[PDB]
């Protein structure tokens, strides 16, 4: 049955003010959304009780950590929209196992950095949205500049919000020349 913090149809569940990721979402749902949620963390294997998800949305939440393998066990997931959240930390293997993922959004989360190889193995990606963040253009972001240069995925123009000498520079236009790290 539909969890009380959710509203469900046959195909879809929309959860609001959830205090934890519910483990009782009906296992046949193919799209799941969390809005204004109470939980602060997304630990490994959080969605194993809904293995048939094709779409996941997180919007207007506050997260302390999205952990390694948060989205593991979801081999059919094609759309993952993580937008308009406060997110303190995302991990290197947060998106591990998402071989079918077509479109990832990390838009409007005021992210200051992204860990190296965060998109490793996302071989089905045609779209990634990175706008509306606050990236610091330092050595920790060097990998992203290289990734933007080699990916076939469509990615919008995004801009450094720091350090001050880099502010408003288009990240897509940077080179590894722009970074001399050790």
Author numbering: 41 to 222
Give the original sentences from the paper that presented this experimental model.
LGI1 is a 60-kDa secreted neuronal protein, which consists of the N-terminal leucine-rich repeat (LRR) domain and the C-terminal epitempin-repeat (EPTP) (also known as EAR) domain4. ADAM22 serves as a receptor for LGI1 and is anchored to the excitatory postsynaptic density through PSD-95 scaffold. The LGI1–ADAM22 ligand–receptor interaction plays an essential role in AMPA-type glutamate receptor-mediated synaptic transmission via PSD-9533–35. In this study, we present the crystal structures of LGI1 LRR, LGI1 EPTP–ADAM22, and LGI1–ADAM22 at 1.78, 2.67, and 7.13 Å resolutions, respectively.
